[PDB]
Symmetry: C3
Subunit: 74 residues, 3 copies
DNA sequence: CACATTCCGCATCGATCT
DNA sequence: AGATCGATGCGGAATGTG
DNA sequence: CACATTCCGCATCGATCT
DNA sequence: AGATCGATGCGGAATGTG
DNA sequence: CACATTCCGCATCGATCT
DNA sequence: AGATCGATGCGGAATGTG
């Protein structure tokens, strides 16, 4: 009941969320050359480049799904 | 003569401005699938995801045009 | 031995670094219309839109190459 | 519940084939 | 060499599970 | 003036047509 | 089924307007 | 060393040419 | 008018250089 898992990462995550395609969007353009990334895969790499923590694109696949279940409570 | 319309939104707006294609640019790639957005439409959605306020892509079409008329004063 | 060259710019630069394609990436899509930009060229324009300083895409070509030589020390 | 972990269309992408 | 078709890999939905 | 609101090329995109 | 042509929708310029 | 400055494939892009 | 081929211009590697 304390410091296992972060709330500065939550701000970083939310920065990313906002940066990219806010309430969507662009789908999956890994269609150019020989390494291009997906939406969640970016946000992940953003958080590793803004804290250091490794938080994966499936740790993200999860969280998000979380946050829409919250905006189902009305 | 006080709190009608914001200057934290001005910073958010300017963040967006800088994020996207600084002094331009990329035009209008809503050309992929079945919902992709235009430059100003992004920045708008950025500000709603960073304050909460609804500020539209025409509220932006306006402001900007403002800010180049200022950089006409020399 | 003081204020020649900046460490707030270093944070701005690192913001950009993180924004765009974190540890890469997207190559060089200046392939749309009649003015679209390269990775470093963006980050540069980000820093001029976030401080004011002109720092060029070759001032960047340099720095970076710096920062991987550091992550060669192990 | 806050989580991780199978699913499900997709959409490319390297190898047979008129 | 150009269409054809199994890789493989993503995001997001649907599920485990502690 | 700081604003909102028509314009203007564009550039896709769903429906007739050799 | 593939070119052809009105939708529709954006950003940015040119205008209202309080 | 922290720097700027040639290189090197690339990959578009405006002008000759079946 | 569509392929063909020198522009030109980027990022990143390899070098100057103070």
């Amino acid at each position: 009941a304390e410091g296992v898992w972060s709330p500065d990462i939550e701000q970083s995550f939310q920065e990313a969320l906002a940066i990219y395609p806010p309430c969507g969007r662009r789908k999956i353009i890994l269609s150019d050359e020989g390494k291009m990334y997906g939406r969640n895969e970016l946000i992940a790499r953003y958080i590793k480049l803004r804290t250091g923590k490794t938080r994966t694109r499936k740790q993200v696949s999860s969280h998000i799904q979380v946050l829409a279940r919250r905006k189902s409570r009305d």
